[PDB]
Design a binder for this molecule. Sequence first.
Ligand SMILES: Nc1ncnc2c1ncn2[C@@H]1O[C@H](COP(=O)(O)OP(=O)(O)O)[C@@H](O)[C@H]1O
Length: 780
Amino acid sequence: MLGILNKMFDPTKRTLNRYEKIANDIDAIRGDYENLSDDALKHKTIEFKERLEKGATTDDLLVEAFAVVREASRRVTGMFPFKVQLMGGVALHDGNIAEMKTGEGKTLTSTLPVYLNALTGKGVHVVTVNEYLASRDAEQMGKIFEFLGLTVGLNLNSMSKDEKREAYAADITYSTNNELGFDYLRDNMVLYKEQMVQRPLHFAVIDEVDSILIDEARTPLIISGQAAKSTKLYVQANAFVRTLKAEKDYTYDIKTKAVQLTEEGMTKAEKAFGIDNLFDVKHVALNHHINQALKAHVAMQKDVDYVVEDGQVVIVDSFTGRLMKGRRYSEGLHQAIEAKEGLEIQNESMTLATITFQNYFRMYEKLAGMTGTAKTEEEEFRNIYNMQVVTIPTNRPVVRDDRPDLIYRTMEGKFKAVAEDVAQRYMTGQPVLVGTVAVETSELISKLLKNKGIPHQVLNAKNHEREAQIIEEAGQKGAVTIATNMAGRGTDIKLGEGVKELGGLAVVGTERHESRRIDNQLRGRSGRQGDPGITQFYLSMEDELMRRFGAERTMAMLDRFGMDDSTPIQSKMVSRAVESSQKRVEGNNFDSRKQLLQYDDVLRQQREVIYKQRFEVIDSENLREIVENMIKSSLERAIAAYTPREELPEEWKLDGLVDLINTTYLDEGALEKSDIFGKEPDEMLELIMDRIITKYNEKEEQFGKEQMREFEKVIVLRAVDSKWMDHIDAMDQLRQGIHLRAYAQTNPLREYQMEGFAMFEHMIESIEDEVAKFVMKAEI
Ligand SMILES: Nc1ncnc2c1ncn2[C@@H]1O[C@H](COP(=O)(O)OP(=O)(O)O)[C@@H](O)[C@H]1O
């Protein structure tokens, strides 16, 4: 609830002039390295490392470091970065967004501050959108860093949990956004601390930062795959519809508890499966399901504070009436859904880890970013991520002709018009690139060109390697490309022999996008480095962004403002109005990603807690914190079990409270002062501590350097398994289709926080039984 996003914050043009000066300072010492030997140069890396630790700052050696990388580059790649690029680096070094246009040299610029900030040995992460663009940048700029005496590392989805660590080991590491997200999450599902692949998140430099932080924001990162030896076993758990005498366990208190089972059930239930009463021989599975299925019949019921069907189960609110869409029953009460009544089964995928890129990337101590289009959502870059967008003067003045939208009346005429324009361009031999929004519209224009027999290339948004090769050749004479929205990103389109003289790459958008950012991106592909190029969008009156005008009629003027689909139309007015629709569409998207951020935030805080607690259960032998924790978890279960079977009218009739003790914690001799034995809550501390601590001491004596072993595979499991994976899944469920009546979107923020901390309070409690019961009742 701090400030409010999109309103206003600090400046430009004190920041730029400062940079300018720096660049010119860089050029000043340009001679100090130019005739230096190769060895003397490499030595600078060391010299910098020595200076930094002795007391100097990154900022203190900027001019120079940058000057060294510049000279290096010129010697390794052939390219001596321009002042505009030098400026870029500063923009990034300040943890800002460097906005430079397509064809400007971002990757080069990234080496500059990447180097500077990699000298600490803390590491640096150079982020791109996809595998290929990493591997490439890694392989090409790899050279320049290595030359200065630094380790480059490439992180891919293929690599072993070993090779990955070894890459995060490198001074500099390259990766796709996703892996960075994944590797983090996977690190927090680990059984031994080594397995983790990541180091502390120091610095991140996203290239194409808009796609990553603005567009790909609206998806969470999900991990899924379920292995509860599920569907099959749930039917089998439900085989116990009959003779629920010997195992029809005791009743309970508060929200829920059926755990206990008389010896006669267990044994014979177990012979119906084939082992003993399970101790922690991958047994947990059967005990938890049998409890669940046993509960689904007696404990949790039908038609009052439990379930109502449709074809499946929907939690209700017995007093309000309405169906709580999106509410999963904790730790696998699918049992109700599936077999108790109607085979409405439910088990496929399972969410095991979730994160937003806005939370993930905010974990880093420093974020910097690069892209051609990022002045638009600037109020967000500085309000969500604390980065100012710097707009960087191009190296060479743009001589492109971004033409005013042409407006046809219907799809067909607009499409036909697109064909014609490509038709004319091929015949001239001028290369054409056609931006599309949808694979299906991508296909239609191709057919249009297949009837006209105009050789071309479609570009589907997938298999990036091929399309990169395609894209270089889209700047050659007679080239014809049609690029699915987000196709060929990251690659320059270099114009061919004498293509300059035909006007350069001509670009044709088949429609304006959900965001002017995307709109300008398209135009971007054309005017790089001061080559000519023309860009033009086509719009039909016949769709979205154009509804403003559905119901428009006239008194004395040309009705519809572009009639009969003969020719096109132009007016600033209509184009102006398209902007509204665009900007309004941009609004929705902001809101939907704000809400996501707001949803993950609940998870974020929830998850940092559990992550921290898990790892602590892993570093558990010298303080005997696995027993100290196991002791707390036990004392909870009691204090909770004790204080309901004793309300404020009366602490009375101890009989089920007796059962509880015996078939939850301790053997038959779970009776003492049978009932009405005085009457206290804190009498329960002594008497249950007695029968449990004495037993724990004796349980840990017969087989005791192992019980530590025993707790660990008990605690960590039940924590990991029922709690986290079931919460994570159940959460993503509520996030999803919390679309029951009487909620408004992102107000559910209110319901979500509420129902999701409720859930957590419980899941923590479920953990607390699981561990107490098992330590006490699982024997060889
Ligand atoms: N200073 C330079 N000298 C020579 N060539 C350059 C220079 N800067 C960039 N280039 C070339 O122009 C292309 C554009 O640079 P790039 O790093 O891709 O930036 P952008 O992503 O803005 O296009 C690259 O393929 C590179 O080979």
